[PDB]
Design a protein around this nucleic acid. Structure first.
Length: 101
RNA sequence: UGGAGU
């Protein structure tokens, strides 16, 4: 079982974004950790789709404004080693293509 | 480096 192609509603929701995954974090943790604030519409990683050498972040996505600004006002900048969280609103949309030619 | 999904 996998995401495949989860259809969001980004055209009518807050579409929050989160990043700054530590050298020991994963999207499954980023989900259980940000799900407690309310809900998450997606939690996914570009992982260069075939090289995964980046993984320095995991683009999580929210829909509730009140739960998106709260998770941001309650976890971003809560760092203690040089990088723990970075969360703010998205202003950029899904890729049409970045992995083929 | 703010997303490369069948």
């Amino acid at each position: 079982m996998s995401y495949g192609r989860p259809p969001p509603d980004v055209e009518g929701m807050t579409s929050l974004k989160v990043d700054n995954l530590t050298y020991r974090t994963s999207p499954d943790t980023l989900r259980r950790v940000f799900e407690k604030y309310g809900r998450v519409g997606d939690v996914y990683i570009p992982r260069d789709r075939y090289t995964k050498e980046s993984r320095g972040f995991a683009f999580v996505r929210f829909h509730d404004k009140r739960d998106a600004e709260d998770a941001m006002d309650a976890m971003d900048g809560a760092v203690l080693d040089g990088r723990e969280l970075r969360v703010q609103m998205a202003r950029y949309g899904r890729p049409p293509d970045s992995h083929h030619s």
